[PDB]
Design a protein around this ligand. Structure first.
Ligand SMILES: C[S@@+](CC[C@H](N)C(=O)[O-])C[C@H]1O[C@@H](n2cnc3c(N)ncnc32)[C@H](O)[C@@H]1O
Ligand code: NA
Length: 271
């Protein structure tokens, strides 16, 4: 796979590799990633000592922020060994009396009770045959007053796009094929109904939906600018092919969020 050393060339120190939130226009990338995490965690009404599950925890930035700012116990799940190892190391290096653990484990195998759940851009990696199952499991492990913040990408169909004045081009179809045949996200995104209808069938109320479309455009622009500025080092760590493929993903996805072809949002879900 792609080395952490490559991603380090374009991500900020949190290692967060999902849509940032430019809560103030002059925030740096790091500040906007912490703002995105805090935006989500504030919606969970966390109290010190609660237990927070992060489904699909990446390299651990949100878990570290949850411990540091919110003083919660944390459990992070991932399917990626590289994600797990960095998460494990970062959490162990936090000075805290709380429980802070990362696991190489899917949510399908996790059955422990937790007080709150967060997830950032993992849901699009789930098979559509598991969308309902995921919400059922999340409902079951939460207490009666539990809350989940689902931050997910989602797509729109031709009819909706057309009603909004947007068309999918032959280039867009080529780009979707590029995504499907690569490690990059976006090849088989859920629709908004795939999120909302399954969450509601499992018993959740959708309290709030916050769209972040243009924040993602800006985030992807920042990653691309960072990667081009480090091009020689990126080629050295990987190769020119990989570098160019990443640039194609980052810039192509930025263009598509700007145009409105796809979206990303935080869904506050309550019981
Ligand atoms: C696009 S990354 C998001 C990483 C992190 N949330 C962030 O904001 O940078 C998706 C992560 O979800 C994880 N993931 C995908 N499917 C999963 C599953 N069924 N259970 C647990 N984690 C999963 C991947 O292994 C990866 O760590
Ligand atoms: Na404390």
């Amino acid at each position: 796979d792609i080395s952490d050393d490559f991603f380090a060339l374009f991500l900020d120190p949190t290692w967060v590799y999902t849509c940032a939130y430019f809560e103030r226009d002059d925030m740096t990338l790091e500040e906007a990633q912490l703002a995105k995490v805090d935006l989500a965690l504030d919606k969970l009404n966390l109290e010190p000592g609660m237990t927070l599950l992060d489904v699909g925890c990446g390299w651990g930035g949100a878990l570290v922020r949850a411990v540091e700012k919110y003083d919660v116990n944390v459990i992070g799940l991932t399917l990626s060994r590289n994600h797990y190892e960095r998460s494990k190391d970062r959490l162990a290096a936090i000075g805290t009396q709380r429980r802070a653990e990362a696991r190489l484990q899917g949510w399908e195998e996790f059955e422990e009770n937790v007080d709150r759940i967060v997830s950032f851009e993992a849901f699009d990696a789930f098979k559509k045959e598991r969308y309902l199952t995921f919400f059922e499991r999340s409902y079951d492990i939460l207490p009666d007053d539990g809350r989940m913040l689902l931050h997910s990408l989602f797509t729109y169909d031709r009819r909706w796009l057309h009603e909004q004045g947007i068309a999918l081009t032959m280039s867009d179809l080529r780009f979707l094929k590029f995504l499907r045949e690569s490690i990059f996200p976006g090849g088989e995104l859920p629709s908004e109904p795939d999120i909302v209808d399954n969450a509601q069938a499992a018993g959740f109320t959708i309290e709030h939906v916050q769209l972040l479309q243009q924040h993602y455009a800006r985030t992807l622009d920042a990653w691309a600018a960072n990667l081009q500025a480090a091009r020689e080092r990126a080629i050295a760590v990987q190769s020119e092919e990989v570098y160019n493929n990443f640039m194609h993903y980052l810039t192509g996805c930025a263009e598509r969020f700007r145009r409105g072809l796809i979206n990303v949002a935080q869904f506050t879900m309550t019981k």
